[PDB]
Coordinates of C-alpha atoms and ligand atoms in Angstrom, one line a residue:
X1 CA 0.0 0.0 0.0
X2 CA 1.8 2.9 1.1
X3 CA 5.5 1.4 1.4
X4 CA 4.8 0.7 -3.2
X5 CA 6.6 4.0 -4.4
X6 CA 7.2 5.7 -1.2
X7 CA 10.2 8.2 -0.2
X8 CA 12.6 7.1 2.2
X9 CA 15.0 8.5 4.4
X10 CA 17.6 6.8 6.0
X11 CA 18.6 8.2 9.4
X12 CA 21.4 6.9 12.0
X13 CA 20.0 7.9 15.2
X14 CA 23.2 9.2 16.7
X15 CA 24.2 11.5 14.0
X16 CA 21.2 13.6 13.0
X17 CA 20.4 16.0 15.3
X18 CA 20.8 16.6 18.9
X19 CA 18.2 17.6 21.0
X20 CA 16.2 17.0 23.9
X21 CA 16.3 14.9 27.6
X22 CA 18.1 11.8 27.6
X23 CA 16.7 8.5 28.9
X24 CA 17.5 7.1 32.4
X25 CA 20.1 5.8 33.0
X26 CA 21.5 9.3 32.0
X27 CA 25.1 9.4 30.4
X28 CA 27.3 11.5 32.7
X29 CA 30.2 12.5 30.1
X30 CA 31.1 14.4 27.5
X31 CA 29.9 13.4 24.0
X32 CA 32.5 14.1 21.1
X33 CA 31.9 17.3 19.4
X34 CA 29.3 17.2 16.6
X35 CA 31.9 18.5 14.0
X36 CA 34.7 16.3 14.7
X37 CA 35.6 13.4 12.7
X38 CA 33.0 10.2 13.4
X39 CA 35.2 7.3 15.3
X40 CA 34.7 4.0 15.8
X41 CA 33.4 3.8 19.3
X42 CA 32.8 8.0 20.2
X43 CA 28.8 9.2 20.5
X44 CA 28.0 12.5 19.6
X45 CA 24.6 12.3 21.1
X46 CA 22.0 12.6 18.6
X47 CA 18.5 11.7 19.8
X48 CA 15.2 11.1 18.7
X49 CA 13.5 14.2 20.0
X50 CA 15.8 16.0 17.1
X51 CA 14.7 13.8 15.0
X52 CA 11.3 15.2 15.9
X53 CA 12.3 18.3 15.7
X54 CA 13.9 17.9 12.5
X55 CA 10.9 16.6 10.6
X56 CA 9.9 20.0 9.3
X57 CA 13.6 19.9 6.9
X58 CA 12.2 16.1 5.7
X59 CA 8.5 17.3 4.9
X60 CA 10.0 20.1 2.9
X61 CA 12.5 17.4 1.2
X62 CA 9.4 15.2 0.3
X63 CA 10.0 12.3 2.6
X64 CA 7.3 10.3 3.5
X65 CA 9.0 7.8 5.9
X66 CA 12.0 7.2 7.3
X67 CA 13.8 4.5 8.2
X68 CA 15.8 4.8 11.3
X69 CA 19.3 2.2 12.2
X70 CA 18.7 0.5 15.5
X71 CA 17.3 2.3 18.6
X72 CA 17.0 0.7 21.5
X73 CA 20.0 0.4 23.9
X74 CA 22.8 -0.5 23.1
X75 CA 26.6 0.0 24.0
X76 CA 27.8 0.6 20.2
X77 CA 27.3 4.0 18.6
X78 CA 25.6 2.5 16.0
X79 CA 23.6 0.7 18.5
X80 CA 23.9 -3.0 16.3
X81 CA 24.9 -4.4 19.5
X82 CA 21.8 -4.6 21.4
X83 CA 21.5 -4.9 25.5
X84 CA 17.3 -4.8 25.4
X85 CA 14.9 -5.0 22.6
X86 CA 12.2 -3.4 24.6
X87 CA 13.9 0.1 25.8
X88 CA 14.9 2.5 23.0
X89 CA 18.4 3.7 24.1
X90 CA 18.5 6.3 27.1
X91 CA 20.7 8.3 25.1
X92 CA 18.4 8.9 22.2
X93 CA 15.7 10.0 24.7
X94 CA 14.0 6.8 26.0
X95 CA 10.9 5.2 25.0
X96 CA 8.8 8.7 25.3
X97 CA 11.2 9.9 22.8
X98 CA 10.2 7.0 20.0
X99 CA 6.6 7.9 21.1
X100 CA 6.7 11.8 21.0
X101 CA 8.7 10.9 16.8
X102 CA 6.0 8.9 15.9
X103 CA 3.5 11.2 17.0
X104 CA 4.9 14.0 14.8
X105 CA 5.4 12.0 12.0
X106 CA 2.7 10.7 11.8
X107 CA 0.1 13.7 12.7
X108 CA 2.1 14.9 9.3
X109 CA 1.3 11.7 7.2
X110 CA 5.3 10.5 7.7
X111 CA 5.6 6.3 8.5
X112 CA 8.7 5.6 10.4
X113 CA 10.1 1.8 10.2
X114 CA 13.0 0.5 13.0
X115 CA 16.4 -2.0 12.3
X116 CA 15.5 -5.2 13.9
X117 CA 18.5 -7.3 14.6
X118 CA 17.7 -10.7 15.5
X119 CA 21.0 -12.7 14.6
X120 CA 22.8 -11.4 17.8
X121 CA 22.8 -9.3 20.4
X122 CA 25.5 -7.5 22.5
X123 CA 27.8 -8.6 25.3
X124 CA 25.7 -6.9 27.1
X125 CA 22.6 -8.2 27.2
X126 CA 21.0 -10.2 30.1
X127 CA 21.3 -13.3 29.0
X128 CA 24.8 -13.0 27.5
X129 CA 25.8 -11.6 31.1
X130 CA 24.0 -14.1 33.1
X131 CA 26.1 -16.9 30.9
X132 CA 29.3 -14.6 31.7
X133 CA 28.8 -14.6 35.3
X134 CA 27.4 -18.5 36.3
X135 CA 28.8 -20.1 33.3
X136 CA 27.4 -24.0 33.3
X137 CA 25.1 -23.0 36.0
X138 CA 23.3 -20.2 33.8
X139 CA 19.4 -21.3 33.6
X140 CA 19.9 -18.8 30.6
X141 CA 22.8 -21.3 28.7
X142 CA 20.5 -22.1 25.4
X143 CA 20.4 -18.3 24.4
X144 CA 23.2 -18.6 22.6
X145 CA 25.2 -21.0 20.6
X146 CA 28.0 -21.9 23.3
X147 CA 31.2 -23.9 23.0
X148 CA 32.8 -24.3 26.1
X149 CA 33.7 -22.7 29.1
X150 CA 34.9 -20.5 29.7
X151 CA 33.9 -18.1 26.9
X152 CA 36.8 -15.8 26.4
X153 CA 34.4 -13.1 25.2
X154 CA 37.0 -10.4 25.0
X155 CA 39.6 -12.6 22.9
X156 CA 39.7 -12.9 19.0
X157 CA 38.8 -16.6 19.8
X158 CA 35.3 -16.5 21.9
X159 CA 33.7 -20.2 22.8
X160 CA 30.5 -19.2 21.0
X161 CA 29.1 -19.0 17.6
X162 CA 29.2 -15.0 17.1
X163 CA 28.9 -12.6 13.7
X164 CA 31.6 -13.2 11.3
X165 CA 33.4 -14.4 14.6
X166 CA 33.5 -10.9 16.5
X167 CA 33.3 -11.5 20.1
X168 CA 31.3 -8.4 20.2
X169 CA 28.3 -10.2 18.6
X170 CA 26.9 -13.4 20.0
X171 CA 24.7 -15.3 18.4
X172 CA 21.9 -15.8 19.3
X173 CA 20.0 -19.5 19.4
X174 CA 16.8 -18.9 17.4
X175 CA 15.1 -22.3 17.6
X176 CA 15.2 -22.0 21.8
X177 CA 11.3 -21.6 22.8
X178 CA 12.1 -19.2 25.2
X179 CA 14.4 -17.0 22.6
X180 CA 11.7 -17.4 19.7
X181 CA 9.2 -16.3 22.2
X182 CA 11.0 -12.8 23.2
X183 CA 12.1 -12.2 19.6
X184 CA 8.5 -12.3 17.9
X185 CA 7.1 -10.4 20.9
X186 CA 9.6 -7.9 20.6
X187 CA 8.7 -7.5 16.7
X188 CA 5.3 -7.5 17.8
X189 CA 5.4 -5.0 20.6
X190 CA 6.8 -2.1 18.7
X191 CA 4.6 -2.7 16.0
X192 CA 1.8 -2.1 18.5
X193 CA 3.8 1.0 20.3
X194 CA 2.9 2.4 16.8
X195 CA 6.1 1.7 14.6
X196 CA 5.4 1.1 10.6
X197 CA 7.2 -1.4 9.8
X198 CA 11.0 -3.4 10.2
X199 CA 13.9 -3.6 8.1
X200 CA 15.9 -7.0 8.9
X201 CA 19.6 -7.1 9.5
X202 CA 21.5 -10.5 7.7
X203 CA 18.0 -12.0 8.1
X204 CA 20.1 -14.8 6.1
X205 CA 21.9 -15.5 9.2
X206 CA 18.9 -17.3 10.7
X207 CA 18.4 -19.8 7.9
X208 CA 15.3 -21.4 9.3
X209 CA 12.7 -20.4 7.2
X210 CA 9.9 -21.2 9.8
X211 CA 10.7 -18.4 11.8
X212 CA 10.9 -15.3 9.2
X213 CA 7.2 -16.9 8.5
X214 CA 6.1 -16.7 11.7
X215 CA 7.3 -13.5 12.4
X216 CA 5.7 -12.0 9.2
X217 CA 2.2 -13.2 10.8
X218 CA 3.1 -11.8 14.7
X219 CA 3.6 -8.2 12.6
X220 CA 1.4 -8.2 9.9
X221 CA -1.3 -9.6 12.5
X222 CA -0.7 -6.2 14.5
X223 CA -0.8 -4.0 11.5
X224 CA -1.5 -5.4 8.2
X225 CA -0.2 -2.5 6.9
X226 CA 3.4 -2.9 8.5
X227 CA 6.2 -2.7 5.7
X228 CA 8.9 -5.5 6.2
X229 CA 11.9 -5.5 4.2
X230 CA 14.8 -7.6 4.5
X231 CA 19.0 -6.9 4.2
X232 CA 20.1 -8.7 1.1
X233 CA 23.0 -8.1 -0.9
X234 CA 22.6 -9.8 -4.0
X235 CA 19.5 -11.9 -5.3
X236 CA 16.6 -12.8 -3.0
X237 CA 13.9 -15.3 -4.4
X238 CA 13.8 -17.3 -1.3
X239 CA 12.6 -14.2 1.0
X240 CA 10.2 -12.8 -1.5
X241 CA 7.9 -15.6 -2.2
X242 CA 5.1 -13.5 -0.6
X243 CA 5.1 -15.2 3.1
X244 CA 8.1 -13.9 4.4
X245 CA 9.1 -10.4 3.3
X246 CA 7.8 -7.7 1.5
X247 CA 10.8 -6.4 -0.3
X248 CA 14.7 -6.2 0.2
X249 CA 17.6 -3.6 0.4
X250 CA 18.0 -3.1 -3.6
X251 CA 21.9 -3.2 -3.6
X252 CA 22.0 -4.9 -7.0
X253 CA 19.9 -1.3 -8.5
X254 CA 22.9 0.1 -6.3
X255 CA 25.7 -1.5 -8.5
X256 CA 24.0 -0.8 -11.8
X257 CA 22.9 2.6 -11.2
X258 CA 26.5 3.5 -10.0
X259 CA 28.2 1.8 -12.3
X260 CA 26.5 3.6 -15.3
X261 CA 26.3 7.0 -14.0
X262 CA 29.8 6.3 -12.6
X263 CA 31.2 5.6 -15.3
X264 CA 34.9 5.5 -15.7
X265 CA 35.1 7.8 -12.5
X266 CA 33.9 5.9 -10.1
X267 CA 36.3 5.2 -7.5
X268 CA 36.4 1.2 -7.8
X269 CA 38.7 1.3 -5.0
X270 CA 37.0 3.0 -2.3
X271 CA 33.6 1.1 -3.0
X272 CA 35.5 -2.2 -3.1
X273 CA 36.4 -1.7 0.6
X274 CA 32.4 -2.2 1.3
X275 CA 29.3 -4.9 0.3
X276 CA 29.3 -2.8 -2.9
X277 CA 32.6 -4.8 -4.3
X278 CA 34.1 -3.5 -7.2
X279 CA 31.2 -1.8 -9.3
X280 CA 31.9 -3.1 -13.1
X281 CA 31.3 0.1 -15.7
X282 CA 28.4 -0.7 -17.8
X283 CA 27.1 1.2 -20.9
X284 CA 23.5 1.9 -21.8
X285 CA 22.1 -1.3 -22.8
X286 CA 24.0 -3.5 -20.0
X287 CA 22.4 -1.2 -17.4
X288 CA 19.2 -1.6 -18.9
X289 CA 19.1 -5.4 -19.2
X290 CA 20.2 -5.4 -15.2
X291 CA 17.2 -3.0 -15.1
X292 CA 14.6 -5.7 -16.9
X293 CA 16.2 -8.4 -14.8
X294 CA 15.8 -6.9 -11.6
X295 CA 12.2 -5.6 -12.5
X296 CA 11.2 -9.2 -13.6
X297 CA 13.0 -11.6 -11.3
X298 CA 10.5 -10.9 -8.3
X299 CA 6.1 -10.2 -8.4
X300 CA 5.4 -7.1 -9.5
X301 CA 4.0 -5.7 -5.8
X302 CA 7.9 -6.8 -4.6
X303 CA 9.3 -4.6 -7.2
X304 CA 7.3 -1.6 -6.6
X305 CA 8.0 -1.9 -2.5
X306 CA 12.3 -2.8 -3.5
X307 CA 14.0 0.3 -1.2
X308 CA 16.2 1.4 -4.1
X309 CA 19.3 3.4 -2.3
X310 CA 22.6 3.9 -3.7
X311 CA 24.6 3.9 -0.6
X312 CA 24.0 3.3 3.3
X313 CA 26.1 3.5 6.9
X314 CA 27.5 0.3 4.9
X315 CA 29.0 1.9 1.8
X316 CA 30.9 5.0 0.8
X317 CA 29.1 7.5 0.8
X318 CA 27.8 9.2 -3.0
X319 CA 29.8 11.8 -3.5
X320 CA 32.7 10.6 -2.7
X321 CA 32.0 7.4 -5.4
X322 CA 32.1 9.7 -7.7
X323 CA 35.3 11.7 -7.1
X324 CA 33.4 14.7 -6.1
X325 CA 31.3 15.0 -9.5
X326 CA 28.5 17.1 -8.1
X327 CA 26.7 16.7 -11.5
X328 CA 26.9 12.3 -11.5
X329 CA 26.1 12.0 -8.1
X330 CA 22.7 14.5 -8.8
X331 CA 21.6 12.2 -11.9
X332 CA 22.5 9.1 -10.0
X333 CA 19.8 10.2 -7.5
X334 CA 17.5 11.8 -9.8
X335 CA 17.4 8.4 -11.7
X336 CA 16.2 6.9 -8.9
X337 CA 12.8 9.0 -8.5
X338 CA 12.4 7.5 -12.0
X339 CA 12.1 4.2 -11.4
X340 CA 9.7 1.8 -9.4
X341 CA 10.2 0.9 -6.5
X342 CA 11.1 3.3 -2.9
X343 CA 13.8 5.8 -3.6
X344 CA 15.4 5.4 -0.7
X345 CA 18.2 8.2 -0.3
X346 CA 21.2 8.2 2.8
X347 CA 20.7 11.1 5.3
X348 CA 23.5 13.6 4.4
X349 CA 23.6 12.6 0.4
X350 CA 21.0 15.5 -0.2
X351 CA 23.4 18.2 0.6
X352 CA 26.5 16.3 -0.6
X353 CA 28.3 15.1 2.7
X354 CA 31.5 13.3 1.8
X355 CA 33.2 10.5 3.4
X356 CA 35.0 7.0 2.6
X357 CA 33.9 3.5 4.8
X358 CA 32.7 3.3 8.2
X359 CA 33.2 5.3 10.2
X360 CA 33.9 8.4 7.7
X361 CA 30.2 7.5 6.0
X362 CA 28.7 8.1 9.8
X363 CA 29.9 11.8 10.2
X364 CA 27.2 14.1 12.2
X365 CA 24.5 15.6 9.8
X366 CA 25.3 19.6 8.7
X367 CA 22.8 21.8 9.3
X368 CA 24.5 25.0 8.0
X369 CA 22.7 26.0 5.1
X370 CA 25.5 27.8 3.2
X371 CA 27.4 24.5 3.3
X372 CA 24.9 22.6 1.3
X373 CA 25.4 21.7 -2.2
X374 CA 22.4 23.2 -2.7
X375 CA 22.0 21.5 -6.6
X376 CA 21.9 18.0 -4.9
X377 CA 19.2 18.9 -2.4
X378 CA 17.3 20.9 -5.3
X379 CA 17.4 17.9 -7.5
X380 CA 16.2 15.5 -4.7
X381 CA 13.3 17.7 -3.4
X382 CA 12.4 18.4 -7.1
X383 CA 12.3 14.5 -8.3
X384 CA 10.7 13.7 -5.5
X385 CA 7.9 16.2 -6.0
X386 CA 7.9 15.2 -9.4
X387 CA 7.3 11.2 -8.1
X388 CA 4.8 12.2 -6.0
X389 CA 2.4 14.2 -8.7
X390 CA 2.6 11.8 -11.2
X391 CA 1.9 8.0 -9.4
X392 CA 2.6 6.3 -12.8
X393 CA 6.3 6.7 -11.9
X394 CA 5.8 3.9 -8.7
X395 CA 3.2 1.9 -10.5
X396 CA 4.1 1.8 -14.2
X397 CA 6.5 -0.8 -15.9
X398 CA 9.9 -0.1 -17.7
X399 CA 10.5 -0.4 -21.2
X400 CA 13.4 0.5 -22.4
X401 CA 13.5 2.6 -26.2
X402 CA 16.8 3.4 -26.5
X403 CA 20.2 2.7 -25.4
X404 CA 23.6 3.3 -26.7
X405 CA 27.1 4.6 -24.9
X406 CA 25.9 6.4 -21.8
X407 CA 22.3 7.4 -23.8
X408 CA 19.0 6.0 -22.0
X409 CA 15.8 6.3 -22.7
X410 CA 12.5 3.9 -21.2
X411 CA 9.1 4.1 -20.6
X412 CA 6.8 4.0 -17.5
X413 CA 3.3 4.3 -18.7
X414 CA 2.8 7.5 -20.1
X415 CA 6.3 9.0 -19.7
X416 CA 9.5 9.0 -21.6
X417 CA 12.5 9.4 -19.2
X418 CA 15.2 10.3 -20.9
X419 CA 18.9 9.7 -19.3
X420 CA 22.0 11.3 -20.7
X421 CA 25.2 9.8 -18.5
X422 CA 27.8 11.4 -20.1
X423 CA 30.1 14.2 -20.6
X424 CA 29.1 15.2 -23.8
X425 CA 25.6 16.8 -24.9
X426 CA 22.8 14.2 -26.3
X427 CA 20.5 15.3 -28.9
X428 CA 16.7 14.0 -28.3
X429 CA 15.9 12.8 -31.7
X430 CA 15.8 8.7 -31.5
X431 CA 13.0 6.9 -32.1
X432 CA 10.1 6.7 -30.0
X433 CA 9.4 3.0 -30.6
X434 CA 5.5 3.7 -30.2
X435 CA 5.6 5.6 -27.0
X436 CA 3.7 8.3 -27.6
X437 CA 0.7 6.7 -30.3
X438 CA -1.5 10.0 -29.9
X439 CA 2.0 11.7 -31.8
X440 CA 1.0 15.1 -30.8
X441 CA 2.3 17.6 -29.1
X442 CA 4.4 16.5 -25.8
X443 CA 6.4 18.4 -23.0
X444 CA 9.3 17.6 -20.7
X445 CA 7.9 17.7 -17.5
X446 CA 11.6 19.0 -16.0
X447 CA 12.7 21.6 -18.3
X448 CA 9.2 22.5 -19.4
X449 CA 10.6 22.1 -23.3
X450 CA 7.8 21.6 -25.5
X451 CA 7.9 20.3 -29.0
X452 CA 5.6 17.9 -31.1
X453 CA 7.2 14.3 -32.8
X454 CA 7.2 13.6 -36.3
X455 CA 8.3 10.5 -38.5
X456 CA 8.5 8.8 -35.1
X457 CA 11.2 10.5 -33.3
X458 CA 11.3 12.3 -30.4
X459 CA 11.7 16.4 -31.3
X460 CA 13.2 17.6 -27.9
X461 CA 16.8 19.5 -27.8
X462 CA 20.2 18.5 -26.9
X463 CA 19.9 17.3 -23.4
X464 CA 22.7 18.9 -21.7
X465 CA 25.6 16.3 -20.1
X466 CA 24.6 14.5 -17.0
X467 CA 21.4 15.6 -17.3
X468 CA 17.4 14.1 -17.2
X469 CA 14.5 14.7 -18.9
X470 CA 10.5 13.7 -18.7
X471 CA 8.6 13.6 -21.2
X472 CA 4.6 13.4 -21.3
X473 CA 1.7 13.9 -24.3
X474 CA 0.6 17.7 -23.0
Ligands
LIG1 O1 36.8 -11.9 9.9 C1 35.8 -11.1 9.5 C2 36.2 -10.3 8.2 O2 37.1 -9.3 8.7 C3 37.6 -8.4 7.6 O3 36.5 -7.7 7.1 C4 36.1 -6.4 7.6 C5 36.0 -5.4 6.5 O4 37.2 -5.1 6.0 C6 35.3 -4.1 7.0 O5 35.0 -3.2 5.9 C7 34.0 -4.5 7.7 O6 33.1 -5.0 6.8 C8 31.8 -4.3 6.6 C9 31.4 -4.5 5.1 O7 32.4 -3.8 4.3 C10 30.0 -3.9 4.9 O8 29.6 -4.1 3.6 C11 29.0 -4.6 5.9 O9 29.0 -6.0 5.6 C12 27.9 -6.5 4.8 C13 28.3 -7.4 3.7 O10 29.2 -6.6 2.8 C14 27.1 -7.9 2.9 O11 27.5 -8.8 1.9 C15 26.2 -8.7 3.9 O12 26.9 -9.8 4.4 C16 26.2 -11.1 4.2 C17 26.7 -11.7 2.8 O13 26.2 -11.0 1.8 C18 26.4 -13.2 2.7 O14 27.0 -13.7 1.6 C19 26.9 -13.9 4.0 O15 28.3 -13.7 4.1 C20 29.1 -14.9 4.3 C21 30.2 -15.0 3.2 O16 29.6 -15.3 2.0 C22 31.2 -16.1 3.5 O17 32.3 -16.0 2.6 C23 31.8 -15.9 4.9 O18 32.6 -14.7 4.9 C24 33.8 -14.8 5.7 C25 34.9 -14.3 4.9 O19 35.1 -15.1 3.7 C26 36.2 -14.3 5.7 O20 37.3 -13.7 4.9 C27 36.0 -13.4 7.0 O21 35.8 -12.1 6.6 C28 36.8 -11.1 7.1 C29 37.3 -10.3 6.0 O22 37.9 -11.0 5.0 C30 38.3 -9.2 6.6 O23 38.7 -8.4 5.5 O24 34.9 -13.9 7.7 C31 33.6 -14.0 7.0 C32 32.6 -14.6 7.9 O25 32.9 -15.9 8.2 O26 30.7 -15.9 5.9 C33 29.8 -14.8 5.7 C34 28.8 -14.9 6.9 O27 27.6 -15.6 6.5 O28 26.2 -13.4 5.1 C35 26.5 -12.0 5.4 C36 25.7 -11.6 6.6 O29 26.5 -11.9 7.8 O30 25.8 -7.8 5.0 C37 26.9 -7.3 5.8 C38 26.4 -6.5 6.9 O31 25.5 -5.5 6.5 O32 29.5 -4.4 7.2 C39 30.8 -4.9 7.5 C40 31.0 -4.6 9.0 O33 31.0 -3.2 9.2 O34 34.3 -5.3 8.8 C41 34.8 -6.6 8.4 C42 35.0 -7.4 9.7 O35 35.8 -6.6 10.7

């Protein structure tokens, strides 16, 4: 329903905005200055009430919901190393603070969907602690997947199954009643408490495919309008059959879009050193046909719900893919308001915030105006008004009418989006395959260029380098 088409923003709780009371217990500290360079284990205090506060900036950007990293407490800045799935973290403002955000966003017809991560928890949750403390004696032992005692938890060999073997993460033992039980209540509960929907970290880390089933039911069965979409890198057939998730993180769109507007300037290197891998260039018709494929492989309601983003707090981030080319990174993002599915667009990539891998992609979110690159912003709030007036562009199909070098041209519906990835100008004058049958007089709904086909062929003028176009019957 709403999550077919929808804007997203995604927003890592401790680097948007700070603002408000902290939760109890209350950190007594200093937090590291806002402007300083983002580390691996400093918190620079962002909360939820900022958030809040911050919603007018995202209703004037066109968002419509936003998905926030993980919230409730946890000892890691970026909170993936939860201590307890029912208390948002005390830092971020408590439980009243999630309440007060939802409120807001949703008196102003914003959803808001949380991180669930279900693999593992922290070192410090109960259970982990109560294993740390009694060892064999632990009535709490079955949690997790343990080898022996003791557990050397702070040694590069721990003596329990953990994420990717970090002792930081231990993993949790999903097919325990008593764990199954306090995971599907926890998804339930905050779907209850008024949350929109959850987005699944390495949901292929709990390969029985009884439980993603189950918990689709528990949250669907408390709001059948709840959005669900799963973190998966690379093809997902198994998790989109219709009874477990709803959609997936589209990193495969990622690769192609980036790889075409890339180009030849996309720093391989720095996007190599993330889940991304080294992005392979592709010309016109290769990106389409990755298009068609990933449009196709999955039922059309799945494609139209796919959360298209280009990067996340797991890849570079844009502008810094692209060698700081301003005008590649705006069409890589425009493109995306083009296409079906949720553009789904990294807090900070709006205004052009820069930065390598973790933590450089994490750095707190710049509120000073005159430091924007206010063409990127422009370009987002304008496509994404542009998405938003014209619903064919989430509910259409793709067609593709012409591609050649860095030249693209499809359909969706009634529109002819035109794509010119390159540095050189792109006359509008290929043919329109049957596009527009009426052949009368049409208009690019960006530029407002006007001008009427003949002989089959579109009429328009150059389109300038890097640059988009929209075309409609008038
Ligand atoms: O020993 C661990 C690891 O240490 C080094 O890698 C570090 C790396 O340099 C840092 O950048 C960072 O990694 C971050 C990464 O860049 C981000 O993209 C993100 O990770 C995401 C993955 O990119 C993404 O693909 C997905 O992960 C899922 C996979 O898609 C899925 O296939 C599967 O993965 C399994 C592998 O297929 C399998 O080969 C095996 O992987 C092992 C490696 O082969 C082995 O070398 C080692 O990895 C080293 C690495 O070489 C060092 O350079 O251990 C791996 C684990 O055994 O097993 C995989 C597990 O199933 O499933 C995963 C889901 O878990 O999502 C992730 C998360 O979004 O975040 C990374 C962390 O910030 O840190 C690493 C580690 O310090």
């Amino acid at each position: 329903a709403w999550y077919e088409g929808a804007f997203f923003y995604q927003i890592f709780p401790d680097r948007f905005f700070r603002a408000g009371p902290p939760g109890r217990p209350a950190p007594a500290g200093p937090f590291e200055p806002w402007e300083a360079p983002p580390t691996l284990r400093g918190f620079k205090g962002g909360t939820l009430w900022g958030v809040a506060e911050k919603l007018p900036y995202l209703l004037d950007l066109g968002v419509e919901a936003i998905y926030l990293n993980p919230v409730f407490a946890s000892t890691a800045n970026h909170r993936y190393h939860t201590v307890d799935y029912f208390q948002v973290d005390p830092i971020l403002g408590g439980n009243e603070a999630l309440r007060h955000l939802l409120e807001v966003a949703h008196a102003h017809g914003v959803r808001v969907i949380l991180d669930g991560v279900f693999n593992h928890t922290g070192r410090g949750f109960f259970a982990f602690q109560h294993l740390m403390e009694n060892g064999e004696q632990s009535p709490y032992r079955d949690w997790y997947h343990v080898k022996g005692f003791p557990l050397k938890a702070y040694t590069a060999h721990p003596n329990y199954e953990a994420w990717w073997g970090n002792p930081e993460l231990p993993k949790l033992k999903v097919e325990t009643p008593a764990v199954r039980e306090y995971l599907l209540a926890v998804a339930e509960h905050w779907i209850r408490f008024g949350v929109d929907g959850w987005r699944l970290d390495v949901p292929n880390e709990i390969p029985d495919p009884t439980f993603w089933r189950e918990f689709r039911q528990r949250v669907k069965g408390a709001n059948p309008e709840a959005y669900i979409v799963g973190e998966i890198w690379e093809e997902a057939d198994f998790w989109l059959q219709g009874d477990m998730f709803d959609a997936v993180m589209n990193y495969p769109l990622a690769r192609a879009v980036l790889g075409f507007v890339g180009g030849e300037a996309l720093d391989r290197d720095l996007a190599a050193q993330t889940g991304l891998g080294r992005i392979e260039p592709l010309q016109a018709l290769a990106f389409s046909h990755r298009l068609e494929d990933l449009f196709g492989r999955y039922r059309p309601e799945v494609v139209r719900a796919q959360m298209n983003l280009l990067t996340s707090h797991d890849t570079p981030r844009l502008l810094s893919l692209m060698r700081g080319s301003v005008e590649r990174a705006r069409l890589a993002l425009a493109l995306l308001f083009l296409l079906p599915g949720n553009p789904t667009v990294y807090y900070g990539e709006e205004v052009g915030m820069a930065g390598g891998k973790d933590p450089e992609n994490r750095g707190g979110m710049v509120w000073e105006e005159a430091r924007w690159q206010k063409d990127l912003r422009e370009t987002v709030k304008r496509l994404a008004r542009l998405r938003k007036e014209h619903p064919a562009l989430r509910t259409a199909p793709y067609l593709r009418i012409y591609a050649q070098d860095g030249h693209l041209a499809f359909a969706r519906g009634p529109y002819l989006a035109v794509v010119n990835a390159s540095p050189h100008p792109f006359r509008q004058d290929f043919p329109l395959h049957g596009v527009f049958p009426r052949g009368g007089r049409a208009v690019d709904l960006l530029s407002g260029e006007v001008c009427t086909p003949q002989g089959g062929r579109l009429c328009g003028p150059v389109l300038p380098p890097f640059s988009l176009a929209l075309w409609r019957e008038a």
